């Protein structure tokens, strides 16, 4: 029998939706070398080139659906014996410019998962590839040149026998795509940053190991006669002085076998190494279990008297630098049956109750 | 004048472009890509250009999606040339694109001797909920250039583009930029 | 963050379902010669070979879904001026044996649409490719050798 | 393909033509809305053809056989019917797109949407003659015009 | 001055008129029909004129009935002439009609050396519910012309009329215009 | 400057006064009776004066009783004189009366080379419910004059007084005027 073809449901502009099987649209195969270093690009391709040569249930729906209101979930099913561990970081950035830096610092901003295969069997995270709207499409991200980058921030503490593979499973979940928009309001409730405060290596042994990371975060991170920049870190340097509850996220990057206990505290630069009374200050102890890999330090408003400067002159010494630092001090000693350093990654997630004062003319440099 | 209005705000210097040295007398020009922070002089004229790294510029270079007004202040120096012998003029042109087909969004025309200032503004506004990714193939979005012309480069020594966000300004998204070199302003003795 | 992967909804044994856009799984292109006769095979292929080299929304769902409780709709959008007309007959049969007859008589039994393009703009009809059960699959019809046959029972009255 | 970067007129020799309303919409830089086309038959009833309409981007080649993966609208005409109104809702467009584009941009690098019109079967008839079909953008509902076009100078994309 | 106000908006360049070449020294003038987009130089003086095709101009040419304010920016270049030797002045005149009997609606008078700018506005307003069909015999409606005079065409090189609609602007009705040729702005090297 | 404010309104030219021809070098002046539309040059200097007939002037001449603000724009041309050789200045003076005893209500002082503009305003206000009959013996009401001085009449060619009513303006009563001759503006080629 005949029917009126104009009135059929062929102009169905639904988003992609269903179970996790029927929304999967690509799988990606990352090769982790037996002997990989820190700061080492494992994968680096455009997010649309992920879906080339694919034949999953939602692959054709993904390409052809004009609007998608759901987020992209990516899950990474990589594992390794507790004996070893490393730290991978997958990360999505809205674009590129020629001959780009792939230092962890540069990348992490915007949208990223960081995990240690040694501890976490798998790791998933959702994100919105259009950061200033509720929607996106396959055609948007192909032409916008959205860029996915997997990087190894810390090498294998004990190398596996053979090469490894990380399978990424790109799906579309059904959460609302909420936008992350930075703006120039002086008082903001939550200013996210995802600023890589730095990788902290502590060698195995007995010595007083102390690591300072300055909270004058603005004006990027260092290189040769050069400096690197995220957007959010460049954005916070718009203001001269600032303050707020700082929400760090400290992560283990070595294996579970390398054990160490770490005190974190706010304090000023003048304090030397071999000053044995760091626990006079208020502080937070961080022991990691075998399975735990991630821990969130928060430092309230009572840790800071006044606001402090976003940038400082590069040539100011630790002796005359009146902005606060975040100390990370080994409480006992770095130990283990196997050789390898106790790596530890600190990441300023965001500032709560942010208050930005003034208007930075700027400084030009990075570290303090 | 003679009594001035009142300048007030913090404008950070982004892009200087010194004019080619002697004996080059011909008419010449330069283009400041205001958003992406690039300085392409016209033809094969050896202009001496620098891009500085104040917070405004670092945001404009790294931010993907942008929205709202930026105020510019174009300063012009300024060779030590007797005022009655000055014949140099400065034509500027805001443009969306740098193609021959596109038109200007604004033209200014200055013939003040020695030195000059020129405050203007323009709103970056774009398709994606009011945001514009500069030079993206998506929706054929485009930048803002600032073509500037020195009719007498013996007399005009250098251009200088200072900028400032209006408080309405908003960004989103990050771009992976290469390492920015540390060029510093060589202040005049 | 981590999650237990065993307990996700990856063993979804739902049938294929949605709008007519999201359940489309193949399109097929039949050529009707300017001067075609009666009793003339236009197309004759296995119903699973329809879906070879296809990239519609439900193509991968169709191939991989183990059970399908829905019927197959096929619609044919062929037309011609009222001046002329012919009679096409599309028809599905559960199998074959070597050197088979493709006379209209043989074919029509089981499941078929017959239409005249001259009068009917388009023509659609649903059917079940497993005639003795409530369900079927792509793997069933590939190995069962279900056979789709389009035949012209009367030529063009005016070419 | 008919581009939806409609602004800046239609072509001629080393020239272009202009309506007022088309010149008016090019006042703005980017725009969006529900587009209400009105497709009309211009040939006789004897020349018969079935036409899919869809929004999509320029990169898609001819001899790409999967246009009905996209959401689309089929248009068969009866003998007596001559006029049919396609509407394309806000869910067909992610963002606004530009009113004008540079003339020298190829189909490969042109990120504004097109309106495709694809023959679903084949053009047929007992009498010779082409299947003509006239598309006319009647109006934009829920129009949203962004920015301020400096202008481009040219027409087609 | 010396500190400027702040220009802000998008003004698109409509009509350029370069001044006759050497040895023509006499006083001369040109008339820009601001609405209908036409450039008639006075007498038989070979001015080199171009009408560009930004969206403003295409609307003004095709729209029948118009209403509300348009802002003009008349720029003047600008020959490379020593500032102490400059004697050139520019008189402009808005007019309703171009007949001898009609008076001016506005006069401006500029003697800035090299270059100059002149922002003004005027409201198109008409009989038919506030709308004006330019040059219609109905109600003896009339256009707006912009007569401009170069007292020294050796020193004044060219005029340039940029325009912009105020947001209050409104049109209705279409006119069948001929094909507009594609003239493009030849930007200065 | 260099970027201008924005002129907007319709000002109609009322009274031109060209300066005496060569070899007359001495300092001279002229007086525009702004209300009654009369141009009396000082002494026996043969200035070449014209009073035009736009609607503003015809109202000001015929209306008896007047009230409210009128905006003036005094334009000054402008001989083709090398800018470094210009020494000509223009002093203007609003006055109530033209008697020696009366003082000025406003003085302006301009030495811009070639050409100049000068916008000002003043409120006609009077005894009779805010209305002023110009030059009536009743209450010793008086006009407004505009004395203008050219220090170098070789360089200053002509004055020109344009006027405009503020919307608050109000008249009443008629005066029997003689037939106004049809003088028309001879526009400059």
Coordinates of N, CA, C and O in Angstrom, one line a residue, chain B residues 86-156:
Chain B
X86 N 56.8 68.5 8.1 CA 56.0 67.3 8.2 C 54.9 67.2 7.2 O 54.1 68.1 7.0
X87 N 55.0 66.1 6.4 CA 53.9 65.8 5.4 C 53.4 64.4 5.5 O 52.7 63.9 4.6
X88 N 53.7 63.7 6.7 CA 53.4 62.3 6.8 C 52.0 62.1 7.4 O 51.5 62.8 8.3
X89 N 51.2 61.2 6.8 CA 49.9 60.9 7.3 C 49.8 59.4 7.6 O 50.6 58.6 7.1
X90 N 48.7 59.1 8.3 CA 48.5 57.7 8.8 C 47.1 57.4 8.5 O 46.2 58.0 9.1
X91 N 46.9 56.4 7.5 CA 45.5 55.9 7.3 C 45.5 54.5 8.0 O 46.4 53.7 7.8
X92 N 44.4 54.3 8.8 CA 44.2 53.0 9.3 C 42.9 52.4 8.9 O 42.0 53.2 8.4
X93 N 42.8 51.1 8.9 CA 41.6 50.4 8.4 C 41.3 49.2 9.3 O 42.2 48.3 9.3
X94 N 40.2 49.1 10.0 CA 39.8 47.8 10.6 C 39.2 47.0 9.4 O 38.6 47.6 8.5
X95 N 39.5 45.7 9.4 CA 39.0 44.8 8.4 C 38.6 43.5 9.2 O 39.2 43.2 10.2
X96 N 37.7 42.8 8.6 CA 37.3 41.5 9.1 C 38.3 40.5 8.5 O 39.0 39.8 9.3
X97 N 38.4 40.5 7.2 CA 39.4 39.7 6.5 C 40.4 40.5 5.8 O 40.3 41.7 5.7
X98 N 41.4 39.8 5.4 CA 42.6 40.4 4.7 C 42.5 40.1 3.2 O 43.5 40.4 2.5
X99 N 41.4 39.6 2.7 CA 41.2 39.3 1.3 C 40.9 40.6 0.5 O 40.3 41.5 1.1
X100 N 41.2 40.7 -0.8 CA 40.8 42.0 -1.5 C 39.3 42.3 -1.6 O 38.9 43.4 -1.6
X101 N 38.5 41.2 -1.5 CA 37.0 41.4 -1.7 C 36.3 42.1 -0.5 O 35.4 42.8 -0.7
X102 N 36.8 41.8 0.7 CA 36.2 42.3 1.9 C 36.4 43.8 2.0 O 37.4 44.3 1.6
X103 N 35.4 44.4 2.7 CA 35.5 45.9 2.9 C 36.0 46.2 4.3 O 36.1 45.3 5.1
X104 N 36.2 47.5 4.5 CA 36.6 48.0 5.8 C 35.4 48.1 6.7 O 34.3 48.4 6.2
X105 N 35.7 47.9 8.0 CA 34.7 48.1 9.0 C 34.8 49.5 9.6 O 33.9 50.0 10.3
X106 N 36.0 50.1 9.4 CA 36.3 51.4 10.0 C 37.5 52.0 9.3 O 38.5 51.3 9.1
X107 N 37.4 53.3 9.0 CA 38.6 53.9 8.6 C 38.8 55.2 9.4 O 37.9 55.9 9.8
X108 N 40.1 55.4 9.7 CA 40.5 56.6 10.4 C 41.6 57.2 9.6 O 42.2 56.5 8.7
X109 N 41.8 58.5 9.8 CA 42.8 59.2 9.0 C 43.4 60.3 9.9 O 42.7 61.2 10.3
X110 N 44.7 60.2 10.1 CA 45.4 61.1 11.0 C 46.5 61.8 10.3 O 47.3 61.1 9.7
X111 N 46.7 63.1 10.5 CA 47.9 63.8 10.0 C 48.4 64.8 11.1 O 48.8 65.9 10.7
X112 N 48.4 64.4 12.3 CA 48.9 65.2 13.4 C 50.5 65.0 13.4 O 51.0 63.9 13.2
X113 N 51.2 66.1 13.5 CA 52.7 66.1 13.3 C 53.4 65.6 14.6 O 52.9 65.8 15.7
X114 N 54.5 65.0 14.3 CA 55.2 64.2 15.4 C 54.4 62.9 15.7 O 54.6 61.8 15.1
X115 N 53.5 63.1 16.6 CA 52.9 62.0 17.4 C 51.4 62.1 17.3 O 50.8 63.1 16.9
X116 N 50.7 61.0 17.6 CA 49.3 60.9 17.6 C 48.8 59.8 18.4 O 49.5 58.8 18.8
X117 N 47.5 59.9 18.8 CA 46.8 58.9 19.5 C 45.4 58.7 18.8 O 44.9 59.6 18.2
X118 N 44.9 57.5 19.0 CA 43.6 57.2 18.3 C 42.9 56.1 19.1 O 43.3 54.9 19.0
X119 N 42.0 56.5 19.9 CA 41.2 55.5 20.7 C 40.0 55.1 19.8 O 39.3 56.0 19.3
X120 N 39.8 53.8 19.7 CA 38.5 53.2 19.2 C 38.2 51.9 19.9 O 39.0 51.5 20.7
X121 N 37.1 51.3 19.5 CA 36.7 50.0 20.0 C 36.0 49.2 19.0 O 35.7 49.8 17.9
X122 N 35.8 48.0 19.3 CA 35.0 47.1 18.4 C 34.7 45.8 19.2 O 35.4 45.4 20.0
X123 N 33.5 45.3 18.9 CA 32.9 44.2 19.6 C 33.2 42.9 18.7 O 32.7 42.8 17.6
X124 N 33.9 42.0 19.4 CA 34.0 40.7 18.9 C 32.7 40.1 19.2 O 32.2 40.1 20.4
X125 N 32.0 39.5 18.2 CA 30.7 38.8 18.4 C 30.6 37.8 17.3 O 31.1 38.0 16.2
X126 N 30.1 36.6 17.7 CA 30.1 35.5 16.8 C 28.9 34.6 16.9 O 28.0 34.9 17.7
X127 N 28.9 33.6 16.1 CA 27.8 32.7 15.9 C 27.4 31.9 17.1 O 26.2 31.7 17.4
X128 N 28.4 31.4 17.9 CA 28.2 30.3 18.8 C 27.8 30.8 20.2 O 28.6 30.8 21.1
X129 N 26.5 31.3 20.3 CA 26.0 31.9 21.5 C 26.7 33.2 21.8 O 27.0 33.6 23.0
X130 N 27.0 34.0 20.7 CA 27.7 35.3 20.9 C 29.2 35.2 20.9 O 29.8 36.2 21.1
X131 N 29.8 34.0 20.7 CA 31.2 33.8 20.8 C 31.8 33.6 19.4 O 31.2 32.9 18.6
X132 N 33.0 34.1 19.2 CA 33.7 34.0 17.9 C 35.1 33.3 18.1 O 35.9 33.8 18.8
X133 N 35.2 32.2 17.5 CA 36.5 31.6 17.3 C 37.1 32.3 16.1 O 36.6 32.3 15.0
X134 N 38.3 32.9 16.4 CA 38.9 33.7 15.3 C 39.5 32.8 14.2 O 40.2 31.9 14.5
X135 N 39.1 33.1 13.0 CA 39.7 32.4 11.8 C 39.3 30.9 11.6 O 40.0 30.2 10.9
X136 N 38.2 30.5 12.3 CA 37.8 29.1 12.2 C 37.1 29.0 10.9 O 36.3 29.8 10.5
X137 N 37.3 27.8 10.2 CA 36.5 27.5 9.0 C 35.0 27.4 9.3 O 34.2 27.6 8.5
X138 N 34.6 27.0 10.5 CA 33.3 26.9 11.0 C 32.5 28.2 10.9 O 32.9 29.2 11.5
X139 N 31.4 28.2 10.2 CA 30.6 29.4 9.9 C 31.3 30.5 9.1 O 30.8 31.6 9.0
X140 N 32.5 30.2 8.5 CA 33.4 31.2 8.0 C 33.6 32.4 8.9 O 33.4 33.6 8.5
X141 N 33.9 32.2 10.1 CA 34.3 33.2 11.1 C 35.6 33.8 10.7 O 36.4 33.2 10.1
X142 N 35.8 35.1 11.1 CA 37.0 35.8 10.8 C 37.5 36.6 11.9 O 36.8 36.9 12.9
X143 N 38.7 37.1 11.8 CA 39.4 37.8 12.8 C 39.0 39.3 12.7 O 37.9 39.6 12.3
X144 N 39.9 40.1 13.3 CA 39.9 41.5 13.0 C 41.4 41.9 12.8 O 42.2 41.7 13.7
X145 N 41.6 42.5 11.6 CA 42.9 43.0 11.3 C 42.9 44.5 11.5 O 41.8 45.1 11.5
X146 N 44.1 45.1 11.6 CA 44.2 46.6 11.6 C 45.3 46.9 10.7 O 46.5 47.0 11.1
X147 N 45.0 47.2 9.4 CA 45.9 47.7 8.4 C 46.2 49.1 8.8 O 45.3 49.9 9.1
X148 N 47.5 49.5 8.7 CA 47.9 50.8 9.0 C 48.9 51.3 8.0 O 49.8 50.5 7.6
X149 N 48.9 52.5 7.5 CA 49.7 53.0 6.4 C 50.4 54.2 6.8 O 49.8 55.1 7.3
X150 N 51.7 54.2 6.6 CA 52.6 55.4 6.8 C 52.9 55.9 5.4 O 53.6 55.2 4.6
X151 N 52.4 57.1 5.1 CA 52.7 57.7 3.8 C 54.1 58.2 3.7 O 54.7 58.2 2.6
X152 N 54.7 58.6 4.8 CA 56.1 58.9 4.9 C 56.8 58.2 6.0 O 56.7 58.6 7.2
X153 N 57.4 57.0 5.7 CA 58.1 56.3 6.8 C 59.4 56.9 7.3 O 59.9 56.4 8.3
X154 N 59.9 58.0 6.7 CA 61.0 58.7 7.2 C 60.6 59.5 8.5 O 61.4 59.8 9.4
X155 N 59.3 59.9 8.5 CA 58.8 60.7 9.6 C 58.0 59.9 10.6 O 58.2 60.1 11.8
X156 N 57.2 59.0 10.2 CA 56.6 58.0 11.1 C 57.7 56.9 11.5 O 58.1 56.2 10.6

